[PDB]
Amino acid sequence: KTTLFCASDAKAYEKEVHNVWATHACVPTDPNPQEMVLANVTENFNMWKNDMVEQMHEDIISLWDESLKPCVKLTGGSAITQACPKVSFDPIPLHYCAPAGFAILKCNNKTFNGTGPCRNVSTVQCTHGIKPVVSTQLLLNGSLAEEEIIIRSENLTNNAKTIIVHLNESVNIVCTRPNNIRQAHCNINESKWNNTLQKVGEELAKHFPSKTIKFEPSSGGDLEITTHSFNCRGEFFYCNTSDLFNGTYRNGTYNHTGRSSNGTITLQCKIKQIINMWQEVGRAIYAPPIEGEITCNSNITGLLLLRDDTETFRPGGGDMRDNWRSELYKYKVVE
Ligand SMILES: CNCc1ccc2c(c1)N(C(=O)OCC(F)(F)F)[C@H](CNC(=N)N)[C@H]2NC(=O)C(=O)Nc1ccc(Cl)c(F)c1
Ligand SMILES: *[C@@H]1O[C@H](CO)[C@@H](O)[C@H](O)[C@H]1NC(C)=O
Ligand SMILES: *[C@@H]1O[C@H](CO)[C@@H](O)[C@H](O)[C@H]1NC(C)=O
Ligand SMILES: *[C@@H]1O[C@H](CO)[C@@H](O)[C@H](O)[C@H]1NC(C)=O
Ligand SMILES: *[C@@H]1O[C@H](CO)[C@@H](O)[C@H](O)[C@H]1NC(C)=O
Ligand SMILES: *[C@@H]1O[C@H](CO)[C@@H](O)[C@H](O)[C@H]1NC(C)=O
Ligand SMILES: *[C@@H]1O[C@H](CO)[C@@H](O)[C@H](O)[C@H]1NC(C)=O
Numbered sequence: 001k002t003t004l005f006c007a008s009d010a011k012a013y014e015k016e017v018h019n020v021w022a023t024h025a026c027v028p029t030d031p032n033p034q035e036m037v038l039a040n041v042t043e044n045f046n047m048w049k050n051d052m053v054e055q056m057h058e059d060i061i062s063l064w065d066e067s068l069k070p071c072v073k074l075t076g077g078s079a080i081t082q083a084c085p086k087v088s089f090d091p092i093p094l095h096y097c098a099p100a101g102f103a104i105l106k107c108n109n110k111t112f113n114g115t116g117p118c119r120n121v122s123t124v125q126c127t128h129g130i131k132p133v134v135s136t137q138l139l140l141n142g143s144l145a146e147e148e149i150i151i152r153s154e155n156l157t158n159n160a161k162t163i164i165v166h167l168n169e170s171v172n173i174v175c176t177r178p179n180n181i182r183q184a185h186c187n188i189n190e191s192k193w194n195n196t197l198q199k200v201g202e203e204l205a206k207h208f209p210s211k212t213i214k215f216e217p218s219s220g221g222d223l224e225i226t227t228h229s230f231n232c233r234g235e236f237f238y239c240n241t242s243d244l245f246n247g248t249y250r251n252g253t254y255n256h257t258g259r260s261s262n263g264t265i266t267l268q269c270k271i272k273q274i275i276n277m278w279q280e281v282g283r284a285i286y287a288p289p290i291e292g293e294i295t296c297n298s299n300i301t302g303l304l305l306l307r308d309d310t311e312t313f314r315p316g317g318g319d320m321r322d323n324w325r326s327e328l329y330k331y332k333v334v335e
Contacts, residue, residue, distance in 0.1 A: 001333050002102050004055050007095040007126055017067035018092040018132075025059070029095055029126075036123040037108070043121055045107055047114035047329035048154040052096055052127075056324045059094070060132045061279045068234065068286075070275070075282035086290045089234040091141070093129025098333050107330045110147040114164075114329040115154075130327045134278060135230035136317030137218070137241055139302030139326055144168050149203045152329060156207055156307075162316050163305040164326045165203075170299035171196055175230075175237055177271060177294040184269035184294070186228075186239050190260040193244070197256070200303070201249025204313065211311040213249040217242035218314050222276045225318040228267065232296035235289050239269040245315050278320045302326050 007029040010022035047053075071084035098104045104127060107118035133140050150166040171192050177184035201213045218226040218241070228239040243265050246258030258265060271294075275284045306316035317323075 001051065001335075002099060004052065004096045004098060004333065006059065007097050008092060008129075010092055016088045016090050016092070018063065018090065021063045021066055022092060022094065025062075026094065027097075029129075033125050035106075037120070038122065039120045041121045042117055042119045043105060043107075043332070044117050045105075045112070045114065045330070045332050046116075047152065047325050050325065050328055050332070052328045052331060052333060053321050053324045056094075056096060056130075056132070056328065057321050060134070060320070060324075063132065064134075064279065068231070070284035070286055072285040073277075073282060074284075075277075075280060084287050086287065087234055089231065091131040091133050093131050095126040095129050096328075096331075097126040101335065103334055105332045105334055107332075110145070111150060112330060113150055114152040114325075127328065127331050130324070133230070133323065134320055135228065135323065136225050137228040137245075137304055137315035138173070138230075138300045139164075139304065139323060140173070140230060140298040140300060142299075142301040142327055144170055144301050149199055151203050151207060152326070159307040162319070162322050163303075163307065163313070164322060165200055165303040165305060166326065167196060167200075167301050167303070169196065170301050172297070173300050174297050175232060175239060175267075175269060175295065177235070177269075177289065179293045181289055181291075182271045184237060184239075184271060186267040186269060188244065188265045188267070188300075190256065190263045190265050193265060194254065194256050197247055198249070198254035201254050202252075204311070205249065205252075208311045211309055214310055214312040215245045215247045215249075216312055216314050217245050218316070221318075223272070224276050224278070225316065227269075228315070230296075230298075233290070233294050235271050235294055236273075236275050236286065237269050237296075238272055239267040241267060241315055243267065245313075278318070 006026040008022035008026040010019040012023040073080040152164040175186040243258035
């Protein structure tokens, strides 16, 4: 309804680029926020029509533009060239704050699906701290659901609408390019993944009850969305998930169909230099990988899914506003 500002705990002495940007663009966090509960009030939220998402999206576009400059940017006809130094890159949390005369309403119902009325409501100065993690298929390093796994969608009947799965237990994913210089891999504990897809299938079954629930790899599209793509220490990883989204949940039981060994699923990855941009329609070209071992140890805290008797779910993504939504869903700005 207005323009928010961000608070961060960044340093102006970190060269890490989220820190540099936040030093320029955000104010320091207030060391003890105020919060004002109101369990009588009951108000309506719609995480899918939320202007905080747009404001944050603009911020992260600006952050990536100041911080991850490509050597070449191709948008439409024009090509833009510039210095593309390697940088230290590691997302830091950002708080979104309502300005004077304006408050942020937080919904505190632990099972709120992002939409409709919510009974127990607070007012706050700022949101919690959100790391702005750009990725497809898997949401990484977010905050977990507190009770059960929540299925969020603007419209579950409309299979073209992205489904956000909010996990209550994170699943570790470790990706490294070890000391081909483009080739890398990720490890996931098959048991932990197994378990979580068991319970995701449970919740999806509540919403599609006659149906067998299948998980299958992303059909087609650009590589950014047919793989799990993300940025790790400045490098762009593209990790094949066909051994990950590969399983059936039949009669209250999940069976993993993807290949593992020693009880870990291993994703084959490539580090790429030509990137289809999430910010706009265009391509970006970066320098070859920095040298040595490149490793990110992340928590999977959510999934992005697309639905095609049987219901089939494939990993999705590509619109980074859904990544922000998955964190801003409980917040509305008012007054
Ligand atoms: C969810 N609906 C379907 C869909 C599918 C695919 C895309 C959109 C939408 N897109 C959009 O909605 O962009 C928002 C805009 F439209 F406002 F620009 C994008 C358009 N961009 C290009 N065709 N170049 C494209 N996504 C990426 O390319 C994309 O995620 N790349 C990438 C790059 C680096 C990293 Cl680490 C990464 F993790 C991801
Ligand atoms: C979310 O809850 C509302 C009621 O508050 C319901 O109308 C809607 O269908 C639900 N959506 C999902 C994805 O469960
Ligand atoms: C997470 O949610 C699932 C399904 O909604 C539930 O069965 C499970 O008990 C929950 N686990 C934890 C650790 O809260
Ligand atoms: C969402 O689903 C379908 C679209 O196929 C349509 O009936 C309507 O837009 C929505 N329905 C509900 C119940 O919200
Ligand atoms: C992922 O790997 C499988 C088998 O190795 C292959 O068939 C598939 O085309 C790969 N997907 C992508 C997007 O590279
Ligand atoms: C599941 O994995 C196996 C090998 O790990 C592969 O042959 C199969 O095609 C995958 N499933 C789908 C639906 O792609
Ligand atoms: C997730 O957080 C950990 C700890 O801060 C970090 O090392 C890791 O690189 C992060 N992953 C991504 C993809 O940002």
